[PDB]
C-alpha cells in the first residue's frame with residue numbers, strides 16, 4: 001500500500017537523522033522533585049518525579065553506572081537511550097530528557113498512570129478476544145514501525161505494556177532493543193517469551209519479536225503463557241518442542257494465528273515470510289480490525305484505567321525508598337561517554 005510505504009519511508013528518515021546526531025544532556029537532577037519509586041531491578045529503578053518549574057510529572061529511569069558495568073549492560077544501556085531519543089510512534093513511551101552525572105544515567109520519560117497490562121490481566125484473569133485483539137493490533141503496528149527502522153525490541157511481556165489515559169498501550173523498557181540489519185546473538189528476554197532460536201544460542205533476527213507476540217496474545221486470551229512451567233529449564237524444553245495446547249474457548253482463527261506465530265522454524269513464522277507483517281494484518285483473526293483507526297487512536301478502548309490524575313501512583317506498587325546518591329568522583333566516564 002503506497003500510503004503505508006511512504007509513511008514508513010518518512011519514519012525511517014526522521015529516525016536516522018536523530019540516530020546519527022543523538023541529543024545529550026537535556027536536563028539535570030535538581031530540576032526535579034522525587035515522588036515515589038515505581039519499580040526497581042538489579043541495576044536500575046523507575047521513579048515518579050515532578051519538574052519543579054512546570055509541575056509536570058515524569059517517570060525517571062535511573063541506572064547505576066557501576067552496576068550496569070558489573071552486569072554487562074553497557075552496550076544495552078547505550079542502545080536504549082540512543083534508540084529512545086530517535087523514535088516516535090503513538091504506542092511507544094516518549095523520552096523527554098536524558099542526562100548523566102558522576103554516578104547514574106537518567107532517562108526522563110512521560111509518565112503513564114494507568115499501570116502495566118500485567119496488573120490488569122492478572123486482576124481480571126483473561127481478556128476476551130476483542131480486548132486481546134485491540135492490544136495485539138497496537139503491538140503489530142509498533143513492530144512494523146520498529147522493524148522498518150532495523151530495530152529489534154526483544155523484551156515483549158505484559159509488564160512492559162503500560163495502559164494510558166485513553167486505554168491504549170505505551171511500550172516501555174528499551175533495555176534490550178538494538179539496531180540489527182541481520183542477525184544478533186545476545187541471550188536476553190524473560191523465559192516465557194523467548195523464541196527457540198534464542199534458547200538454542202543461534203544468530204537470530206527480528207522473527208523473535210513475532211514469536212513473542214504469539215506468546216503475548218496467548219497469555220492475554222488464556223490468562224497464562226503457552227509454555228508455562230515451574231522452572232526456566234522446563235520452560236525452555238517446552239518452547240523448543242513448541243508443543244502447545246490451546247484452551248477450547250479459543251476461536252479457530254485465534255488458534256490458527258498462534259500456530260503461525262509460535263512456529264519453531266523461524267523460516268516459516270508469520271512476520272518473517274515474503275509478505276512480512278501483512279500475513280499477520282490480513283489474517284482472519286484481525287478481520288474486524290481497522291488498522292488506520294487503531295493508529296489514529298479513534299477506536300474506543302475496551303478498558304479505561306482508574307486513576308485520579310497525572311500524579312496518581314495507585315496502579316503501581318510499593319517499594320522500599322532508597323537514596324539517589326551522586327558520588328563526588330566520576331564513575332565509569334569512559335564507558336558512558338556517548339550517553
Ligand SMILES: COC(=O)c1coc([C@@H](CO)NC(=O)C(C)(C)C)n1
Nearest residue numbers: 038039040045046059110111112172
Ligand atoms: C511511564 O511510566 C513508566 O515508564 C513506568 C512506570 O512504572 C514503571 C516501572 C514498573 O512498570 N518500571 C520499572 O521500574 C523498571 C525498573 C524498568 C522495571 N515504568
